[PDB]
Design a protein around this ligand. Structure first.
Ligand code: F3S
Ligand code: F3S
Ligand code: F3S
Ligand code: F3S
Ligand SMILES: [Zn+2]
Ligand SMILES: [Zn+2]
Lengths: 103, 103
């Protein structure tokens, strides 16, 4: 599962669709974590889709990541700021790849 | 159109589904304004639906108001806190019944 201390343990290295990306990032095998309010560890995500299936406010969208060993698609927190802190995604993810921290 | 100063001009008289309701409220003809972040004047709303049709984060839901002269259904800001301040609803409403104020 995702490191609950990722925001302090990792370096921010870039930005994607309005959110920060925490490294290391060495495409295509290592993609890091996307998001600050709603963080998704792309290296753990296996594209199960329960998060997208549970979120009532459309926080996630599928984002293609060809060449990644865990999956070739990931749930990207494009609308992380719409999060109403349901904590559903955090609990439905079979690999515990999501961490939500209210700002 | 809605009074942009409604939050100070009107009295809060109740709560509905997690949001405040600003009076006067004398059902069924006078229902007031629902919401603080995303305020919808139920007395102006005619159930056009453009707001629901435009909102990407599901802020609104239909709420029945039988007996109201403007319409018998209203767009209720059930998820006002998911608002990402698109200002779309504010502009699509044909009667300017919506006012959005970031907290
Ligand atoms: S595996 Fe990925 S698709 Fe969602 S349910 Fe977990 S973050
Ligand atoms: S289910 Fe959606 S509302 Fe936030 S707690 Fe997860 S991104
Ligand atoms: S009329 Fe009502 S249904 Fe929406 S578009 Fe205007 S608040
Ligand atoms: S379109 Fe939706 S995101 Fe807010 S500005 Fe209106 S309730
Ligand atoms: Zn991203
Ligand atoms: Zn309401």
């Amino acid at each position: 599962g995702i490191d609950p201390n990722y925001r302090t343990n990792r370096q921010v290295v870039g930005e994607h669709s309005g959110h920060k990306v925490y490294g290391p990032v060495e495409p295509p095998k290592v993609l890091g974590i996307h998001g600050t309010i709603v963080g998704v560890d792309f290296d753990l995500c296996i594209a199960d889709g329960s998060c997208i299936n549970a979120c009532p406010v459309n926080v996630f969208q599928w984002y293609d990541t060809p060449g990644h060993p865990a999956s070739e698609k990931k749930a990207d927190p494009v609308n992380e700021q719409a999060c109403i802190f349901c904590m559903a995604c955090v609990n439905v993810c079979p690999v515990a790849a999501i961490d939500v921290k209210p700002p």
